[PDB]
């Protein structure tokens, strides 16, 4: 990326390209730098000035950025339409055959189910209204439904249907048969750097999409990333997602993945998602999270402590990227600077990353889960199968009237 090479802004003046070219070429001119790599950097700087100073060459190099901007502007128009008029009551419980449980939580459970007409398989998230009111998660579960129905991105699980009855709220999502990234990661031990990087790039792209909508995800962790049949991530579990234009304050999420400013009483923004990306890349490459302890407050002390220990098998580029994502100071954290996500996409650790190809899913997955049909749930763990009770009376009607 030529602007990064020259230390420049896309909207740079012709003059500012000329001086940045003189400024950067000096720091690598053989007369002043015979260190390893000085000569290739000197070539790259000359290349950058040549593209950026020629108006025709610059106009078409600028198309990469302009296509991203156009893609995001359209994604926003589409999102805002569904955001303003959300889908409600687009199916009914009796339309589905409940198979088995695929996962659980404080709120309820996700069940493998099959549509009785079309035979299609889905994952139905069941939430008990009373429990949700009890755990004061009303707005959170309204955020989740309204956000998941309105977004559309290759690495976000699709909400297919939603509805409620007297007792429960229901979210019927696309079924992802490959299982959680958590199981595979714990089983394999750790991913190799190019393996972690393949997943990380998909997350970077998804956060770029989500933050352009002013959405904060707030629960990045391997438990929440599903592997599809071509080995690509599907993000599920939007129970802490929120639309936030300015700042927000809630202490929620998973202790291991919380940014300092979530734990601290001050408010925070979308930058907490980039901190959690740092935690995720660390856990993926190391096999364990960088802040674990028995008590949450012990985890909180390590998080705000500003100190991180890296395994020996961590490359220099990985540690340098992780130092910038796991940056306690908000004004220094990657993702949160003037250049935003581009600082992350232009980082050396990602140098081999073909972003367009990732987005198109043209890249070969380094892991494809062992499949045996559209219902071989062996990539998921087994859970106790409780039965689904629907009361004769509507519980919490008012609290959930917009669901």
């Amino acid at each position: 990326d030529y602007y990064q090479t020259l230390g420049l802004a896309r909207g740079a003046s012709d003059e500012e390209i000329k001086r940045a070219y003189r400024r950067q070429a000096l720091r690598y001119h053989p007369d002043k730098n015979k260190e390893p790599g000085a000569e290739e950097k000197f070539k790259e700087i000359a290349e950058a000035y040549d593209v950026l100073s020629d108006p025709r060459k610059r106009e078409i190099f600028d198309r990469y950025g302009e296509e991203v901007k156009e893609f995001l502007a359209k994604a926003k128009e589409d999102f805002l339409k569904k955001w303003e008029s959300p889908a409600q009551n687009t199916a009914h419980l009796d339309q589905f055959e409940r198979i088995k449980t695929l996962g659980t939580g404080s709120f309820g459970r996700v069940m493998l189910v099959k549509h009785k007409e079309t035979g299609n398989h889905y994952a139905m998230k069941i939430l008990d209204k009373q429990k949700v009111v009890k755990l004061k998660q009303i707005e959170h579960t309204l955020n989740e439904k309204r956000i998941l129905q309105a977004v559309n991105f290759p690495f976000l699980v699709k909400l297919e249907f939603s509805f409620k009855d007297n007792s429960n709220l229901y979210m019927v999502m696309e079924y992802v048969p490959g299982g959680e990234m958590f199981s595979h990661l714990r089983r394999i031990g750790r991913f190799s750097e190019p393996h972690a990087r393949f997943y990380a790039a998909q997350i970077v792209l998804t956060f770029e999409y989500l933050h352009s909508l002013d959405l904060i995800y707030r629960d990045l962790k391997p438990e929440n990333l599903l592997i599809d049949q071509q080995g690509y991530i599907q993000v599920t579990d939007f129970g802490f997602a929120k639309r936030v234009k300015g700042r927000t304050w809630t202490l929620c999420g998973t202790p291991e993945y919380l940014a300092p400013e979530i734990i601290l009483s001050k408010g925070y923004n979308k930058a907490v998602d980039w901190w959690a990306l740092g935690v995720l890349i660390y856990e993926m490459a190391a096999g364990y999270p960088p802040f674990f302890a028995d008590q949450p407050i012990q985890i909180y002390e390590k998080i705000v402590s500003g100190k991180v220990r890296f395994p020996s098998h961590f490359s220099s580029d990985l540690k340098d990227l992780l130092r910038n994502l796991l940056q306690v100071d908000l004004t220094k954290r990657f993702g949160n600077l003037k250049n935003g996500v581009n600082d992350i996409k232009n980082h050396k650790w990602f140098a081999t990353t073909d972003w367009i190809a990732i987005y198109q899913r043209k890249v070969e997955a380094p892991f494809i889960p062992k499949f045996k049909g559209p219902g071989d749930t062996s990539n998921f763990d087994d859970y106790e199968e409780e039965e689904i009770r629907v009361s004769i009376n509507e519980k919490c009607g008012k609290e959930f009237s917009e669901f």
Binding site: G105, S106, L135, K136, Q137, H140, F182, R186, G189, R190, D219, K221, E223, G239, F240, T250, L251, C252, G253, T254, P255, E256, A286, G287, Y288, F292, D294, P296, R309, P311
Partner: peptide, 20 residues
Amino acid sequence: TTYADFIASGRTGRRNAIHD
């Protein structure tokens, strides 16, 4: 190693969320 401390800790399981 820290990875050894990780599995020597029983807490290699699914992490609970918090919502204060």
